[PDB]
Design a protein around this ligand. Sequence first.
Ligand code: GWE
Lengths: 401, 532
Amino acid sequence: TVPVKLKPGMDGPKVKQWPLTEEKIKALVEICTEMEKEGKISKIGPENPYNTPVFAIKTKWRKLVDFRELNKRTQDFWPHPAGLKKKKSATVLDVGDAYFSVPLDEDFRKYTAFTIPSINNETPGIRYQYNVLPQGWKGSPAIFQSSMTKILEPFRKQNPDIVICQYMDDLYVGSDLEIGQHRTKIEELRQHLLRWELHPDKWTVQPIVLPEKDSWTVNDIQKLVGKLNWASQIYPGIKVRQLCKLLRGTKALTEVIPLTEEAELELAENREILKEPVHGVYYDPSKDLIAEIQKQGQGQWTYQIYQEPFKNLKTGKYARMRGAHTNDVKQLTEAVQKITTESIVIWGKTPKFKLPIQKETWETWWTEYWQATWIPEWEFVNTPPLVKLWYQLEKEPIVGA
Amino acid sequence: PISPIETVPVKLKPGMDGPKVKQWPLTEEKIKALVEICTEMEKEGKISKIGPENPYNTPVFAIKKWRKLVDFRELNKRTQDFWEVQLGIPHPAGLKKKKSATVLDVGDAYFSVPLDEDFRKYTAFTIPSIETPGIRYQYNVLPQGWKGSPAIFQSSMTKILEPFRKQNPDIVICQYMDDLYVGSDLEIGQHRTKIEELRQHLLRWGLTTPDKKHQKEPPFLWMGYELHPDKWTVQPIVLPEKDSWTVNDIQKLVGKLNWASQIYPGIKVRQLCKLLRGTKALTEVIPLTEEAELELAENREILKEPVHGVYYDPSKDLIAEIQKQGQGQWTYQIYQEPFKNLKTGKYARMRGAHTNDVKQLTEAVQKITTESIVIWGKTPKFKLPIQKETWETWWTEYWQATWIPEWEFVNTPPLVKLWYQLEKEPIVGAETFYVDGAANRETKLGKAGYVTNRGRQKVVTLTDTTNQKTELQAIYLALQDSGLEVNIVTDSQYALGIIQAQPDQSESELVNQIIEQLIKKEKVYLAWVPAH
Ligand SMILES: Cc1cc(S(N)(O)O)ccc1NC(=O)COc1ccc(Cl)cc1C(=O)c1cc(F)cc(C(F)(F)F)c1
């Protein structure tokens, strides 16, 4: 086994276990009892002070350990196929079981210590740590690196067309073949792997679209002007001078105001300026990727990925999944997973999220709907009224798709 | 007898060394007692006479016959950290109803487990002399008072109860400190036999269990609770009658009163808390007001009530109902069968800078939900004093992600509703007030006013004000002077916040005033435009 180390001066994770539902606890006990038998994990004592949270997801239950903290504290290791985002179609594959075969440095195991909580604190938790490479750990894909090339070299070489990228436990397979032929090449790989539905191009960036009024009212201009003013932070060429001149006086909020020809042009120049994303925005590896989400309501969500304020790398909209209506929390996690997934596909790293949800609310229920082998970073924020109003103006399909 | 269980490898914190604390001098009377006590422990195999090669040492003391007391604060300061010795304590409402439950005190079991031989050196302590070399020892077992003893003991007890548990899945054993609570639905004779099987089993591992003189029997005192076979109650609460109360006495009192409001309905401490204003010392005597005497009086009557709950029945529904006692105050009870509460509670008035009742409601839900997942491993069916339509209208159009688990409506007033709803669009035929506020943030002298489209206008000169307050006052005036339908235009960034949140309570007196005004109108539309 290769000796893995924590980053200099970094101590092990000592994250507390969040309470779980009985259903979920029983599951983990079963899963862990079996793993124990297979010598994948071993119970530990109190002398091991470290801890990483764990939980269960989805049919049967799957175990998911939140190594986010251990990953940060884990040493770094020694490419992203920019051709992945271009392929007509990509399929995600869970290659986590791969690591269970590789053993883990014994000196590093103590850090993988996790706990299965007990209902009503009637008994102490059940502490375990890993013997083999764990799923969700930064080091696992890293160590098992050489072994993943070997099993992939043939398939790749055979199909030098298809692009394959690996992130944590997932394997992203990018191709251009038609559906059937794609799924076919996938199963071909599966099989190959069994012995040991995204569309990147279709993701067009949407432009803001200023309202088109038959006749404008004082209010319509006030709102339109507020949005533009704000939006001037992105497009400096945006002007609201002539518009703000129509706004002189103390007219009824509902009174119709005829537009002068300057206002006409001003709005017209403004519409042109909005026709395309701002010039000069490029991705920077040395910097964190940022994902901000705003709840638009009616099941609609708008997001923006960027590293520098107002210099978006991508922006978008997400509409709740079928049967997610009464659950805001559900819609958001599904949005996070989708935004996080596109991020991986495009940049090969997950972004940190600015979630318009209260810490407690999110932390109480997000795992009930989580489904990825990974977990991004997040912070909770207070959406500025205007930022919401702005991206609510994004353009949408003539009819649909 | 010491336990034949393997030791847990302990180490001193990063880099630091074992303690070398000086032995406080003692009286012949005390040294005498320590010599005897220690001789016993040495005999029992608990401590080992060691030599001078040990540079470490911890101070020993004698208390009241006499009892030895070793001070490991230093050692604990140098001893590695351990697993959080189960910080969460069990709540009676979460214990499953069982035909029989037995308590097994495994106390002196700190002295019953072996100490990592490598670490024993750090535990060295010294018995004085009348002067000459004192008698030196070190521990061979978990020292009482040492940092790792609780965790190592609990870890040990867990290993030990492992086989027995697998062989008796019907039986349930709870581990809490130096105690074992063993319960089952077996026939009382069968239960008793298994208990004895266990004593014998623990005995096998060097864990002496109680004798008939130390054996506890129902009811059981549990963190202020009395656990009876088919229900729990709370140990009577005592309110010290006096004719002279100091600040300290009053706070003390408030403290207990606050704890009792959880279980008991109707507890109040406003007039009593009032007594704490401007206090200069804890010993300061504060005379009780009339209202205060009355309060304290009625509370005593409330505590004289037989408030009880029941145990958990994992086969029946878990229902949780909520009421809005007052603004910001919420009460709840979690039961399975009507009136048979597992537990009840109350949530202190949150003083958020700006929020609304429907929000606070969801926050209460959440706390209860988290609390439930902890106590029962499940989340309750909610019975909320809010109409599904009211919930639907607020949530779907609220800037923040929010949610409530499966719930139903229960019309038990007062209900939680939306105190107002800003119009979606401008109002036609409604005066339009263009409000504005400005102030020298330095001299704090400002002006607030408006100008409606109908020609009505006003301006007020304010001193000792802030710009935020002038702008807010601008709006207040508009609402104040406007009719039941008004359109308000402001370039206030904060108002932008009201439009999004539509709060019905806040920290600002101003905002609160405005809210009253807002609530009162029949139709209000707030519009924001960039300043200048
Ligand atoms: C209190 C009682 C007496 C009898 S009886 N007929 O006297 O033997 C039978 C059941 C019960 N209790 C129940 O049905 C439900 O309670 C229980 C159900 C199961 C178990 Cl293992 C213990 C209890 C307790 O009463 C109990 C008492 C304590 F002091 C502390 C704790 C603990 F620390 F674990 F939280 C639990």
